[PDB]
From a paper:
Human GBP1 is a membrane-active large GTPase that can disrupt microbe-encapsulating membranes.
To visualize the interaction between phosphorylated GBP1 and 14-3-3σ, we solved the structure of the purified protein complex using single particle cryogenic electron microscopy (cryo-EM). While the overall resolution did not permit de novo modelling, we were able to unambiguously dock previously reported crystal structures as rigid bodies based on secondary structure features. In summary, our model suggests that phosphorylated GBP1 is sequestered by 14-3-3σ, acting as a molecular padlock to keep the protein inactive through inhibition of dimerization and GTPase-activity.
Author numbering:
A (entry chain B): 1 to 69, 79 to 231
B (entry chain C): 1 to 70, 79 to 231
C (entry chain A): 7 to 59, 112 to 157, 165 to 238, 262 to 583
The structure:
Amino acid sequence: MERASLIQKAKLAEQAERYEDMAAFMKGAVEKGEELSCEERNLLSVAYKNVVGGQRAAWRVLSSIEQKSPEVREYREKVETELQGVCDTVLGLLDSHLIKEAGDAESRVFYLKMKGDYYRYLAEVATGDDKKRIIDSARSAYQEAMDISKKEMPPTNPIRLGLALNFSVFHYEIANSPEEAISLAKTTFDEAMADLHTLSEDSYKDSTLIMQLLRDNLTLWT
Amino acid sequence: MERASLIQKAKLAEQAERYEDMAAFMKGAVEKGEELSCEERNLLSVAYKNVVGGQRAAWRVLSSIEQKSNPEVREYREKVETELQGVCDTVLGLLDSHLIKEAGDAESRVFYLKMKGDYYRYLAEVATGDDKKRIIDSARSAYQEAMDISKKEMPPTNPIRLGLALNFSVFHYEIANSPEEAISLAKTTFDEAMADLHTLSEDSYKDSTLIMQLLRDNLTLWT
Amino acid sequence: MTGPMCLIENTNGRLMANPEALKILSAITQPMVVVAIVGLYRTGKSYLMNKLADSWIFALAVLLSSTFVYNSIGTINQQAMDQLYYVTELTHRIRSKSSVEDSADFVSFFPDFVWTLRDFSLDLEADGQPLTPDEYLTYSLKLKKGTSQKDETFNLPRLCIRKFFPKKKCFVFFVQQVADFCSYIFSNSKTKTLSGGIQVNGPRLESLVLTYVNAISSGDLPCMENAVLALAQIENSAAVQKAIAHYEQQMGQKVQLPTETLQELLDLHRDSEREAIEVFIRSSFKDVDHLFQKELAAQLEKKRDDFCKQNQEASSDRCSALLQVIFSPLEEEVKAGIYSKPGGYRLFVQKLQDLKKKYYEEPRKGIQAEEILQTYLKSKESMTDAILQTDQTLTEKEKEIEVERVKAESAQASAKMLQEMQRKNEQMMEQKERSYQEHLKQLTEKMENDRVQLLKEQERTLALKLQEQEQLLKEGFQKESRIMKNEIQDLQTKM
């Protein structure tokens, strides 16, 4: 069908809270060849975030049941495999349709951050060596997004903050470096506050919510 | 795989909140040919109920958005319908080609006929024209048969009897368009439950009390 | 009160309790049903409250009331629900305990909710028959399917009202509608209660006001748990004082010093102590670590020691006095030589035995009777021998017999004194153990009663949450219904 309607069905999907359908529509809209607008971009991460979120939660529930004293493992693996399917789909979509397929610094950072997040999820369920490879491909994506944000965006831009937030989660929960996670989260927060004045009602609500998430993490981490 | 492990996976799936997987695990269990225990029957209904609960809520969003009448929106709603019907259909096959009558005790018999009434009811919601009429009939006959058995085999306080009565009344109001009949059933079902509760120990008091509340809430909202 | 008074002042951005109002509250000892009204300004709130006769104000109204009346003009539409952010914001203003989930406890202590809709413009017409205002409220709080930001915003305040308040009621508004609202309040509003079934009266409400306002003034969040504990500190301290007062009163009205025996005094102590502990137990609550009861125990022990000292002193005085009255005349007769004549030993021993008998027959000598007598008799031992050896009417063999008889009687007197001493120590030890067991007994009984009361409260919360879970499922919302099951599991870990 037409890109215009694909976009329309995703909005409907999100309304009816049918994220799997929503992610599929967006995927069809992406393969249409044309770049996505800011609005479209968010539809894409919201759809896939919800789909993958359910699987990640399922996985965590199961793996904990497995560790806490045959079926558990077999089922955890099924969920895990299904989760890796989605991540490879998102990553493929990014590598051959979205990443640097545009010009804007915001669109570029957004896509590279998304690449970091999905490699990060793949890292949550991987084991020895395969994990090291995945972890390193996650970091290079975050770092490249970080380099672009620090040169192209003010310290309060919500995308830059979302990126810095998730990159700190990466340091703490994946790269096993609590030290680095805490300082980046703290450094991102301060430089954010120090500019909050006249942050324009534009991205106010978003950056404000991410700033709170940064704090929650700092508290939980310390 | 072994029935026992299918049941275990259904329980793991429930904890993982993967109802679709759960439903498929209970379906495998049901196909083993052995009767379901009380706990197992509840696992089966929780599964499919959650699966269908999601499609319904989605269909109800897409419908109001469409406004029942006043492109894309139409096409997507129809797809959600097809899906809902698919789930309802496999539940009905499970009941008609396995669970119904292959059971002995009154409880289970009423439980499956109730379930049968429940899913024909979900099919009715998304049906129009004469299709809805035929569906409403088969839903009514299943609920009635369940009602005939509960009135004959169980006491006014049995939670399952109350549930059936509750759902049957909902059917009369939301589907059969017969409010009065829906109200009288609920009233009677509730009263008869009271004048017998003075002897109902917490050994099941909690159960009935929970459902009795739902009957009055509906009674209150229908008035 | 001839008329209303400001309870909490709001000046220059600061909320502060009015001392004059707190004073009035301290004087009202009867149980209170508290009804608070909130809503947009100029909506006829004060007018309606006379018929019955921002975020912090809203939160305080929730914390202090039995029934919370939210008043608005019009219908329950999007515009009206946007104003209910004040309810959603309660999760950021109120803390249930201090020891996304804390709000799961709100339904256990929040007031019943009543929505009063003024200048109502709908006929509520519906197929068959019209909706009642309560059914209209149910209709208005139904959720919308979807996960969009718009959907979440629509559902949030509705979910908060449905999940935070234990009961909901709606009234639309005219003279008869006001009459029906007042009748409902007068018949359904419950006495304000705190965890443990504690009924709030004037002094208790005063405490809550001070604690919550002080918290807000400190830049902290008002916490229900902290308020109950703060109240406990006050009442438990008073309970210890009341119990000690009761002990002192009972002992004073019944003790007669010196007591006939130590058992007499300890029996009275035990009885008074049991009554005192009962006074404390019924007047206290939330005595964490039993610190207050331990303080009471320490004070009663000191009180017991004081009575024992007074008793021993009273006995010593009485017995020493009797010694002077009974034996002094004999000592002087002996020193005067009255028994230094032929046959005087027999007369002396007979007199001495008669005097010892007299001493023993004197009433209520007390716990020092044997020690006082024996110490005296031993110190004057030489007197007997002096008279014996002097008497010539007694053969030497007879004197030898008497010396051995006197030695045996001295040993028996010593045994009476030694036993008196040993028995007293045993009785003190036994009383110590009995007192300890009495405290344990009453404490175990109170803890059992507290456990039952808490479980009862938890069962009510469980019933309310199960009810909502079912409504959500029946309504078709599994995502939210499943979230309820989560809160239910967490509640059950506490039971």
